[PDB]
Scaffold this active site. Sequence first.
Site, PDB file in Angstrom:
ATOM      1  N   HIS C 328       0.873  -1.365  -0.045  1.00 45.98           N
ATOM      2  CA  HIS C 328       0.015  -0.043   0.124  1.00 45.98           C
ATOM      3  C   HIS C 328       0.946   1.330  -0.066  1.00 45.98           C
ATOM      4  O   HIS C 328       0.879   2.004   0.983  1.00 45.98           O
ATOM      5  CB  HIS C 328      -0.842  -0.077   1.098  1.00 45.98           C
ATOM      6  CG  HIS C 328      -2.069   0.961   1.144  1.00 45.98           C
ATOM      7  ND1 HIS C 328      -2.300   1.744   0.081  1.00 45.98           N
ATOM      8  CD2 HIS C 328      -2.647   1.574   2.172  1.00 45.98           C
ATOM      9  CE1 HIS C 328      -3.170   2.818   0.325  1.00 45.98           C
ATOM     10  NE2 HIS C 328      -3.430   2.393   1.846  1.00 45.98           N
ATOM     11  N   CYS C 358     -10.492   3.733   0.856  1.00 49.25           N
ATOM     12  CA  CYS C 358     -10.613   4.483   2.013  1.00 49.25           C
ATOM     13  C   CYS C 358      -9.426   5.447   2.088  1.00 49.25           C
ATOM     14  O   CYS C 358      -8.423   5.426   1.515  1.00 49.25           O
ATOM     15  CB  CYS C 358     -10.807   3.675   3.394  1.00 49.25           C
ATOM     16  SG  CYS C 358      -9.319   3.000   3.661  1.00 49.25           S
ATOM     17  N   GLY C 360      -7.640   8.428   4.820  1.00 48.75           N
ATOM     18  CA  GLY C 360      -7.299   9.014   5.948  1.00 48.75           C
ATOM     19  C   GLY C 360      -7.873  10.478   6.005  1.00 48.75           C
ATOM     20  O   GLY C 360      -7.749  11.174   5.153  1.00 48.75           O
TER      21      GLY C 360
END
Lengths: 392, 394, 371, 391
Positions: C328, C358, C360
């Site tokens: 990632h 998604c 942060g």
Amino acid sequence: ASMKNCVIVSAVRTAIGSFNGSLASTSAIDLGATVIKAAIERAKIDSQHVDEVIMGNVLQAGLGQNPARQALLKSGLAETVCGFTVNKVCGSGLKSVALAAQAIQAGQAQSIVAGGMENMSLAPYLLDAKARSGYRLGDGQVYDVILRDGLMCATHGYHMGITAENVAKEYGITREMQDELALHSQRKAAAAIESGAFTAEIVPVNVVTTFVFSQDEFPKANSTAEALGALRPAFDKAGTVTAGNASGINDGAAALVIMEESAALAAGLTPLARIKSYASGGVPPALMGMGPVPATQKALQLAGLQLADIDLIEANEAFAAQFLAVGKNLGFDSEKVNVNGGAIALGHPIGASGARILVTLLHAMQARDKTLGLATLCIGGGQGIAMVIERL
Amino acid sequence: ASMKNCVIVSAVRTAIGSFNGSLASTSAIDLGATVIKAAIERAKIDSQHVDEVIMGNVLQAGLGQNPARQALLKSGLAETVCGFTVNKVCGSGLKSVALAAQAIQAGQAQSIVAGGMENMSLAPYLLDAKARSGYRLGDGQVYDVILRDGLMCATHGYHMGITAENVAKEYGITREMQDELALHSQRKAAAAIESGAFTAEIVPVNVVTRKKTFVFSQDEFPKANSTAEALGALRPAFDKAGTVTAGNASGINDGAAALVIMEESAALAAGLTPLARIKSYASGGVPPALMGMGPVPATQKALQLAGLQLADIDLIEANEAFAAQFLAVGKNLGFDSEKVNVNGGAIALGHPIGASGARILVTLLHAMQARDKTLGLATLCIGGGQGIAMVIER
Amino acid sequence: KNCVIVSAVRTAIGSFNGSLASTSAIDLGATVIKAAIERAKIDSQHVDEVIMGNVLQAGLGQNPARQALLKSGLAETVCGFTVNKVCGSGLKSVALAAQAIQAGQAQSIVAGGMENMSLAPYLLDAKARSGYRLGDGQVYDVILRDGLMCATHGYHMGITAENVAKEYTRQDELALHSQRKAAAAIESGAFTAEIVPVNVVFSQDEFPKANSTLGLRPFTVTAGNASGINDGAAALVIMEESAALAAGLTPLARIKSYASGGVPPALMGMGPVPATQKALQLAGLQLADIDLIEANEAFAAQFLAVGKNLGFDSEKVNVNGGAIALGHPIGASGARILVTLLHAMQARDKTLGLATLCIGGGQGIAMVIER
Amino acid sequence: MKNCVIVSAVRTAIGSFNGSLASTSAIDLGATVIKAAIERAKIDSQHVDEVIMGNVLQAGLGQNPARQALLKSGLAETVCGFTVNKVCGSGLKSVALAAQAIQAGQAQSIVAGGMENMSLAPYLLDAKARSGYRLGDGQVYDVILRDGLMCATHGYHMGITAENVAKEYGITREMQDELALHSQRKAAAAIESGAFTAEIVPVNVVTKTFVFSQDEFPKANSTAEALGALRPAFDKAGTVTAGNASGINDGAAALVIMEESAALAAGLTPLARIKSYASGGVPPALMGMGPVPATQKALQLAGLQLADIDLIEANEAFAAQFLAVGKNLGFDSEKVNVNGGAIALGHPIGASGARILVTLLHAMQARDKTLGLATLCIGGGQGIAMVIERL
Ligand SMILES: CC(C)(COP(=O)(O)OP(=O)(O)OC[C@H]1O[C@@H](n2cnc3c(N)ncnc32)[C@H](O)[C@@H]1OP(=O)(O)O)[C@H](O)C(=O)NCCC(=O)NCCS
Ligand SMILES: CC(C)(COP(=O)(O)OP(=O)(O)O)[C@H](O)C(=O)NCCC(=O)NCCS
Ligand SMILES: CC(C)(COP(=O)(O)OP(=O)(O)O)[C@H](O)C(=O)NCCC(=O)NCCS
């Protein structure tokens, strides 16, 4: 009043750790506490009778208030026991023993633990004062404390290694001579370790992060002339000084119990040696490696002795270049010098080394039944220190 | 051989700089050199006859190899003159003189320059060892060397100011008592300064910067116009429920001090004028939490070694690290307050930690001379639970 | 106007302090930009802009995207800019390229993202610049401060995953599934078409843990059921449809819709829910119309909660494995998944695809493409 | 394709380096202007679709500064945002992106602009700190220089690119200092007449406590003799000085951008239409010339000639570059930076692009002018330009 005699009642050291090696997680102060405690134990002295602790420590940055006092508290001595930290660079650990002896001779104390301690692996990095007032604008530097406070000349701004090149040139000490000396020190160190010659003087360190560290780990047991000869100069591309013919960066500690003679005897203790004389000398910073010359001459003079009277010598091997020049200048009998190897093989935990060589000296005298000993080191900044002791 | 007598032949200091004040650009080592040079000059000793330089210095971080030797070389002494640096925290500067005396008493030297030097304004910051082995993943800390190596207790992890709170409680020293003492020290300092009482003992420092050039010769930490009401309005500095404040505690400061110490017969043979004899010295240990009481065992032992009772002492320099601690020490020992810090103390003057021990001895001797007094005591508390004391005699 | 993808390429993904740990984000970006251009067969002189995601921009120098485009060999007349929407950055960049094309402001853009988390620096606070004066300071790991720690709550993305897990168990079954699918894809050569080698020749994803298998200790969430800290880049050439055809290029997919969604920072893992719902709405589609899905596996916990919330057919999701196995690299992942999605669609001849991740700070982003 | 209008435009006053805003984070400055733009527009805050903010020195500021700023402004957690880095172009690029999204029918109401606090930029230890220095010194890197003001291609300051341009275009020290003085005089005149009062939102600074509402970088009392006595800042043999260059500064700016019909349906007052925007590329060594291709392209996209423009904000990164751009394009100087420019007002890098647009629109309003151009040079060899039409 009359001056009093000072005797060594115990002498002990840690094994010397390699840079980032076995002792790299044990603070200088904890190493100091270990040797203080062991020296006390081995002397059989009543710990309540210790008057002072005096420890050498050069890289004091970030270690907290008065590292010697921290070490004594950690050793289990009472909070009524005083102490202070000495910094005479590489001379620190011997200067501390000299100071202990002076206090005793002067009747100001009866029992002192003295030595030194260094953890070069754990030395910090430093932001200069501009960090405190504000960098404002523009780049800055982050300074390796080993170099800034330990290994760089504060007068000239170049490495102790460059002072060794300076001495090599001044005294005609070639690469070949330097590497031959290096190999000799390796060989003597390996022989001493194999025969158990360091067993009596070493106190083990339990390292819990779990294992026991009790053997000097800086020696390069597979050392060969050909390997040493293949190394590149470390400090000057055109130089003679290499990692192979210089001491290292190392961790360790050493300590001795020093007592007024009549007090030791009255307490039923066994004096191991008498401190006969000590002295410091000064030389130019650029030739700091020659410091042992005036210090040794003065110590022998104070002792009423000639160099030939000395049976064994510990002369620290900061650099083969300087060790050899000092030897040629003073006329050392090489067979008498660093009989178990020296710092090229064993390492150079700078604030401890002066005490370390004294421990090694005394034990080597005991093992070989010799009467008079000389310990000396060169000191960054252009100084030297020497001590003469008499067994037993 | 026989023990010898040690005399002080000169005694000098810089004026004391405030934090980020007039000496904030002048390195500890340069301040040390200035006092070394001036002590030698004032003694009228032949500089070729100095045997050693011994200097106190607490915040050695990043100052380079063996600050004392640097300072002696910078002072103009020959490369054959040895030296070393002493760290007994706030005791360092007096411990250096004690060591010089001892060496002379033991016949190992005839002439030493000793004292101390500190520049707290120029103290650095540290990355810990994780920076060397590698932070790897996760945050680290950046450490103020004044606190880590100077002002925080290594046993308890709290400020010297908290040890002062500890003492205040243990000895019943109220905020009111502390602030009254503070005001007294301010007053005495202000009087001494204005009247020229410090003129003799101070060596000027030339300060050369881009933005300005000037001579620094007057203690700048004192707070004129200090008032009981103002002092009473200050908030506690170290514990929100405490009694210790910036007004009743010494400061963070810069300065240096040095003295020439000699074997008595050698001084007299050289036609030099002994200013005082060092009669005794001693160090004492106490619990780290009560470090402020260090001067009690140190003073008791020094007096005993000197064959004196406290009442025999004419003038006393007892360092004012904190009013709390100063007062408790005074109560314990029973000091005659009229004899103590007659020209003011560190609450007004400042506290350059590695220099203060020598600084107070300089001040003590000059005050004894001015008042024609015979016996003097200098004593200070020491972080880590220690004290150090010296008795001198005119 | 209509916007099409004409090429899609990525580096293999490097492990923390692994094979790409000496190759700067910008050099990784330049590699994928050059390769996307080459694979598209477009005249390089016709590129109108470069848009690249990059989260840990600290110390990387002026406008990393422009540095990367210059390093790729594009002319100094070619403009570019750097995007930060945390883990969304690489997909946001493509969505922005599409938007510019749809709006007729450009005809050809290279978009994607680049990240080298191994090379991220440490920071002294501003107090260093104005002066610490007195008192200690802190030294900050930029991966954490700018990348992996919540700026609202001050705790790790991993804690937001624990939050989601509790809101919606010890995740390990999903982890093993991803490892198995990744290993199968790698071994069979399924990633061969989408990867451009990097001469450090690194050409195989190295984060997968063969022989995984987990049941380890938890900051549930463990290292075994969470994605990693990783290095990599990805890029795509995006064009106006008529221009691509006129130039004799081959469109690979049409970008049908894209959208971003916001959720609470504490539940940032759920960002893909509103982003996906909005992107489907914009596309006139229901979830069931989607053939293949790349839903990033920041944490098994979040991936599973998103799946249960939206009702994903697990057979359709991350068919070649996901970030638990593959890694990632935060500013690149959004583009990386889109690359993977398109190539998986081609291989399986599927028509509609969804990519979503998604973000942060409590966001999500989604894109629907049509092969 | 839909039409996009500006509905509000606001900025903070610009702080000097270590000055009045030096304790107020970029993100807090951003939040202040986002909140104020929303308030001034009279839009229902629940109708904001996105926030887009420029910020160049993002180091250590935490995940996605723009999202942090929007949350701090009081917008709901459903409102998306992202942070844009086109160096000095970032703040204008953010508005151009807002307009593009609206033109493309992907949004109806966006708050866009930029934010920078150069005073609070950190210092960096490089990656060697993570693996371990081991033995030997390292460096500590000023993030302003590394990420903001140094060329990533050539490794020298933006100030050196300005020396490059000065040489290439024959712009002397004398010419540069004369332009600097003019900017100072115009700024002082504007401040004195209250010309920035409408566009500035005060910042409450709590440390002492005070309201900062006036640009503090201007050197009222500036004189030709004083400017002439300064030493070159970047090259000992150079022409560029701190007096004829912009500063390092703190500030933020934001605008509410809407689809035209949506604004009118909400009963709001469009202030201007965004007519065109464009970015241009030039060599990194001559980055100061970026505004040339960006402006030419924006005018072409708008169907205009330069002469049709009534008022111009051309950022004064350096007098050298500003003058060269002017000579190249043939600006009517009476139309340019009428209230002063960055040599006097400062250059908070990620905000300046939006800052000049805010100043442009308010100057257009005050002087009843129809067409306006905003343009800036961009480190790395870029430029960006926008054309707006009042009202
Ligand atoms: C040129 C530089 C380095 C100057 O900054 P600093 O080094 O902080 O210099 P300053 O302290 O502001 O000024 C230097 C001197 O010039 C003086 N000065 C500047 N403008 C003046 C004026 N109009 N009248 C009188 N004096 C002036 C200052 O007072 C200062 O003198 P002192 O030392 O006596 O205070 C500058 O701030 C900078 O880098 N600007 C460019 C920013 C940039 O590159 N932005 C991106 C554009 S692409
Ligand atoms: C730099 C070298 C010469 C070699 O260390 P390196 O870590 O660079 O080389 P390797 O140990 O990895 O072979 C060496 O450790 C060194 O610093 N020697 C001098 C240390 C020393 O002896 N100091 C006392 C001064 S009197
Ligand atoms: C913290 C204060 C009390 C005040 O300093 P500040 O810079 O915080 O105070 P202001 O100048 O704002 O009043 C002070 O400088 C201080 O630490 N004094 C004690 C110093 C000290 O502990 N010396 C060793 C004693 S054994």
